[PDB]
From Swiss-Prot, chains A, B, C, D:
Homotetramer. 2 homotetramers cooperatively bind to DNA although they do not contact each other; cooperativity is achieved by DNA kinking and unwinding. Part of the relaxosome, a complex composed of plasmid encoded TraI, TraM, TraY and host-encoded IHF which binds to the F plasmid origin of transfer (oriT) in a site- and sequence-specific manner. Interacts with TraD. Also interacts with TraY. Induction: Regulates its own expression from two promoters, requires TraY as well as expression of the tra operon for maximal transcription. TraM is in a monocistonic operon. Residues 4-30 form a coiled coil. Transmembrane segments: none annotated. The gene is traM. The chain holds residues 60 to 127 of 127 of the full protein. It comes from Escherichia coli (strain K12). GO terms for molecular function: DNA binding. This is Relaxosome protein TraM. Changing residue 29 to L/Q: Increased homotetramer stability. Belongs to the relaxosome TraM family. Conjugative DNA transfer (CDT) is the unidirectional transfer of ssDNA plasmid from a donor to a recipient cell. It is the central mechanism by which antibiotic resistance and virulence factors are propagated in bacterial populations. Part of the relaxosome, which facilitates a site- and strand-specific cut in the origin of transfer by TraI, at the nic site. Cooperatively binds 3 regions in the F plasmid oriT locus; 2 are required for autoregulation while the other is required for plasmid transfer. Bends oriT DNA less than 50 degrees. Plasmid specificity is conferred by the TraD-TraM pair. Changing residue 17 to E: 100,000-fold decrease in conjugation efficiency, but tetramerizes and binds DNA normally. Keywords: Coiled coil, Conjugation, Cytoplasm, DNA-binding, Plasmid, Repressor, Transcription, Transcription regulation.
Length: 68, 68, 68, 68
């Protein structure tokens, strides 16, 4: 008897907790002295790149237009 | 013949292992000298912020009250 | 028409890639000078703790005994 | 009334955002001075190892040959 609900609860807790934690690790890493002056790892540049990636995948699976 | 059970096993192993690993990486990063004195990255502050985020998403999908 | 197969493919690629990457980040972070001599972040200690966590969750959902 | 669609949306946003963020954290960590000259953590070596892992799991669940 596979408990899909409990599996979903664990899955969600893990992925939400991981994303919230990784967002902080990304900010801390952006402040590291060995990437100062490296445009690729400037925090605003990273956030924009991540935003574009997430938005494009979301648009593939959950398009704003439900009748393309 | 898609093996949903084996897919679920891989998914769970990955997300649980990742979350357990990320929790440790977060602790190590909190101790980094370049974020000393930065309240945003103080470990207790980060943990509270993460806790609030996880709790709010869990309450959206798995509310304590099953008859709202 | 929700493409569950393509969604599953993206989900798996992401979680497997993330776990493989996080395993390396964990190793690099274990070598950081600010956690030298901190038993909590000694690599073998971290790996054992992670292993116990993953094993216990896997045993909850996919027990070795299929007739408890 | 469990909203599978909204759950899927949150799951996808989290895993895609996490993977995009972790890919950047991996690059920053590869540049860390304490792993200079350590072949295990050379960036190209890490990327190849990750690629092999992702490819093998993808081939297990979504084989290029649909009639083995």
């Amino acid at each position: 008897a596979f408990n899909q609900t409990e599996f979903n609860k664990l899955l969600l807790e893990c992925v939400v907790k991981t994303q919230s934690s990784v967002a902080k690790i990304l900010g801390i890493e952006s402040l590291s002295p060995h990437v100062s002056g490296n445009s690729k790892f400037e925090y605003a540049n990273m956030v924009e790149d991540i935003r574009e990636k997430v938005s494009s995948e979301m648009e593939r699976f959950f398009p704003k237009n439900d009748d393309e």
